[PDB]
Structure formats: C-alpha cells, structure tokens
Amino acid sequence: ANPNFFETNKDAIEHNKQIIENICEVLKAADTLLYYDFRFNNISKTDAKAIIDCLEANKNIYYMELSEHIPKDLIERKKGLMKKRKPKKKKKKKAKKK
Amino acid sequence: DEMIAEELDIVRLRYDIKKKKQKKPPRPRNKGKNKKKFPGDSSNKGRDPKD
Amino acid sequence: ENLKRLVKGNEGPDILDKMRAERREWIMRELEKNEFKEAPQDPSEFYNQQVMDPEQQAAEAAKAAEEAKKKGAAKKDDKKKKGKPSELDEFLENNKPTGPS
Amino acid sequence: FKNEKDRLFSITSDMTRQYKQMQDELLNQVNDLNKTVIEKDEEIKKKDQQIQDMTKDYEYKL
Amino acid sequence: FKNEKDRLFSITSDMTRQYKQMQDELLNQVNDLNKTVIEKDEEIKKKDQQIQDMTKDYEYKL
Incomplete structure (x- = not known):
C-alpha cells in the first residue's frame, strides 16, 4: 500500500510509543490509581497489548476498560486480569437500630 | 465468513459461553454393503486404471 | 482472469467491510435475543x-x-x-397432452 | 487518500521517466533512413543531370 | 480527493497520449523516411529508364 509509510509515520509511532510507556509507568506506579477507562478510543492493538502486559506489574489497579477494537483475545486476557484484582465487595454492615 | 466465524468463537469464549458439547455425529459405520464381487475383481484388486 | 483479478483488488474492501458489519450486527441481535447466554453455533x-x-x-x-x-x-x-390399476388410467397417463419437456 | 495520492504521484513520475528514456533512446533507424533518403536524392539528381547532358549532346550531334 | 484524482487522471491520460503519439511520430520519422526512400528510388529508376531510352533513340537517329 505505502512504500514510505514507516518513513512518513515514524513521528506518530514515536509519539504512540511514548504515550504507551507513560501509561505503563503510571499503571505500574499507581498504588492508589487503580481505575482507568480508556474506552471509545482508537488505541492500536500493539499499544493495548503493551498496556495489558504492563498491568501485570501493578495488581493494585482494580479496573481498566479499554477500547473495544483491541484484539478480542487480549480483551479476554484483560477481563481475566481485572477479575484477578477486582476489590472485594465490602458487605454493608447493617446497623441494628436500638 | 472466515473472519466472522473467528469473531463468533472469540465472543463465545469472551462471554464464558460454555460450548454445548456437539453430539459426535453417528460414525459413518461401514455397514454390510456386499460389494458385488464381479469376476476378475480379485485379479484387479489394487490395479491402477493406467495399468 | 484479468477482470476477476481487478475486481478482487478493487471492489473487495467496501463489500468486505459492509458485510462484516452486517454479520456483526446479526450476531449482536442474536445475543440480545438470547440475553447473551448462548452464541450462534x-x-x-x-x-x-x-x-x-x-x-x-x-x-x-x-x-x-x-x-x-x-x-x-x-x-x-x-x-x-x-385393486390393480385400470387400463384407462395408464392410457390417459401415456397419451395425455405432451407437455413441455 | 494519502496512500492513493502518493501512489498516483509515484506512478506518474515513473511513467514520465520511462517515456523520457525511450524518447531519448529512439533516434537510430531515423538516422539510417535519413542517410538512405539523402543517398537516393543524390542519385535522383545525378540521373536527372545525366538525362539533360546526354540529351543535349545528342541533340547537338543530330 | 475525487476531484484531485479526476484531474490527475486527465493529466496522465493526456500526457500518455502525447508521449505515445510522439513515439509513434518518431516511428513515423522512420516510416516517412522509408516512404521518401521509396519515392526517390522510384524517381531514380524512372530517370534511369529515361536516360536509356533517350540515349538509344539519339544514337539511332544519329
């Protein structure tokens, strides 16, 4: 299709790589930041897979819902990872009035 | 159609849809079809048409 | 051969995308119908x-x-x-209007 | 559209280059036939001169 | 992009026709060279026959 596609889009590739690296760093070092919604976004398949792989370092993160156009196998992997870290539903202690 | 079959399988796996075990189709048992042993069948048993 | 190659090269993407979207829409409709419990075989x-x-x-x-x-x-x-079939029935069946084969 | 525009520009440039190369190449048979035409014209002129001179000489004799 | 593609296609078609007809006109240089060679050779043979007839008749009348 494009003999010089990489030559022309090296800048876009570099920017996407930088954004993905920042996302990975934030996910790994976010002890409190554990809920992320990257849905409805044009996140490339490679970038989404990189983010999912980086998630494994930080198990504190309890939620991340990413774009729907990510590969479906990776989507299932992300669902499994999020299920592995879903916070326990704290049973609301019903105060017995007296 | 090939891509959509992949998509359907992946969606089934995604939604934890236990794939209902498809009953193994009745084996094509080699029923007692008495192949008519015409004269010379044994003599031509395994002979290529060119031969 | 040349025209089939050209059609494959050119007209493929648009129909591919439209009909793949149609198939995905049908899959979604079936999932909604069955409450996402089972998918098409x-x-x-x-x-x-x-x-x-x-x-x-x-x-x-x-x-x-x-x-x-x-x-x-x-x-x-x-x-x-x-009872055996009558001769008249056979004669009628044989000699009826010779329809368009 | 970016891809199509780039590909069309490349195709146009390549076709122009090939046409220019072929135009530069083709000059040989033209030169050879030019030489042949010149030689044939020279022969025509020589034979016309022969006709004129020989006719004049014979007319003087007669 | 439809307008761009249509304009580029028209330009490419016009330039292709021009280059093809110019290469054909180089081959036409060759062909008209052959035509001129044929015409000049016909004239050469006509002038040779004129020379022969003229010389023979003049020698006879001498």
Whole structure:
C-alpha cells in the first residue's frame, strides 16, 4: 500500500510509543490509581497489548476498560486480569437500630 | 465468513459461553454393503486404471 | 482472469467491510435475543434466519401446503383393497397432452 | 487518500521517466533512413543531370 | 480527493497520449523516411529508364 509509510509515520509511532510507556509507568506506579477507562478510543492493538502486559506489574489497579477494537483475545486476557484484582465487595454492615 | 466465524468463537469464549458439547455425529459405520464381487475383481484388486 | 483479478483488488474492501458489519450486527441481535447466554453455533445461522424472501416465501408456502395436504389423509387408508390399476388410467397417463419437456 | 495520492504521484513520475528514456533512446533507424533518403536524392539528381547532358549532346550531334 | 484524482487522471491520460503519439511520430520519422526512400528510388529508376531510352533513340537517329 505505502512504500514510505514507516518513513512518513515514524513521528506518530514515536509519539504512540511514548504515550504507551507513560501509561505503563503510571499503571505500574499507581498504588492508589487503580481505575482507568480508556474506552471509545482508537488505541492500536500493539499499544493495548503493551498496556495489558504492563498491568501485570501493578495488581493494585482494580479496573481498566479499554477500547473495544483491541484484539478480542487480549480483551479476554484483560477481563481475566481485572477479575484477578477486582476489590472485594465490602458487605454493608447493617446497623441494628436500638 | 472466515473472519466472522473467528469473531463468533472469540465472543463465545469472551462471554464464558460454555460450548454445548456437539453430539459426535453417528460414525459413518461401514455397514454390510456386499460389494458385488464381479469376476476378475480379485485379479484387479489394487490395479491402477493406467495399468 | 484479468477482470476477476481487478475486481478482487478493487471492489473487495467496501463489500468486505459492509458485510462484516452486517454479520456483526446479526450476531449482536442474536445475543440480545438470547440475553447473551448462548452464541450462534456457526455463521450459517444468519443465513438460515434470512433464507426466505417475501414473494418466494409465499410461493414456497403455497407449494408446500399443496404437496402436504395429501400426506395427512394417508395415515387412515390401511386395509383398503389392492385393486390393480385400470387400463384407462395408464392410457390417459401415456397419451395425455405432451407437455413441455 | 494519502496512500492513493502518493501512489498516483509515484506512478506518474515513473511513467514520465520511462517515456523520457525511450524518447531519448529512439533516434537510430531515423538516422539510417535519413542517410538512405539523402543517398537516393543524390542519385535522383545525378540521373536527372545525366538525362539533360546526354540529351543535349545528342541533340547537338543530330 | 475525487476531484484531485479526476484531474490527475486527465493529466496522465493526456500526457500518455502525447508521449505515445510522439513515439509513434518518431516511428513515423522512420516510416516517412522509408516512404521518401521509396519515392526517390522510384524517381531514380524512372530517370534511369529515361536516360536509356533517350540515349538509344539519339544514337539511332544519329
């Protein structure tokens, strides 16, 4: 299709790589930041897979819902990872009035 | 159609849809079809048409 | 060969995208119908669902009804006589209007 | 559209280059036939001169 | 992009026709060279026959 596609889009590739690296760093070092919604976004398949792989370092993160156009196998992997870290539903202690 | 079959399988796996075990189709048992042993069948048993 | 190659190269993407979207929409409709509990066994389920066309639907329904109305009455005739077919019936069948083969 | 525009520009440039190369190449048979035409014209002129001179000489004799 | 593609296609078609007809006109240089060679050779043979007839008749009348 494009003999010089990489030559022309090296800048876009570099920017996407930088954004993905920042996302990975934030996910790994976010002890409190554990809920992320990257849905409805044009996140490339490679970038989404990189983010999912980086998630494994930080198990504190309890939620991340990413774009729907990510590969479906990776989507299932992300669902499994999020299920592995879903916070326990704290049973609301019903105060017995007296 | 090939891509959509992949998509359907992946969606089934995604939604934890236990794939209902498809009953193994009745084996094509080699029923007692008495192949008519015409004269010379044994003599031509395994002979290529060119031969 | 040249025209098939050209059509494959050119017209492929648009129809591919449109019909893949259509298949995904049918899959979503089936999932909504069955409350996302089971998915289609194979992609042929969409074709089975959309086999019939309106005019062809009516024509085939009429033909099937005409053919099948006789079968229901065949369960009762059990012990009637086995009379041989008449010569007149055979003669009529053989010498009737020589329809368009 | 970016891809199509780039590909069309490349195709146009390549076709122009090939046409220019072929135009530069083709000059040989033209030169050879030019030489042949010149030689034939020279022969024509020589034979016309022969006709004139020989006719004049014979007319003087007669 | 439809307008761009249509304009580029028209330009490419016009330039292709021009280059093809110019290469054909180089081959036409060759062909008209052959035509001129044929015409000049016909004239050469006509002038040779004129020379021969003139010389023979003049020698006879001498």
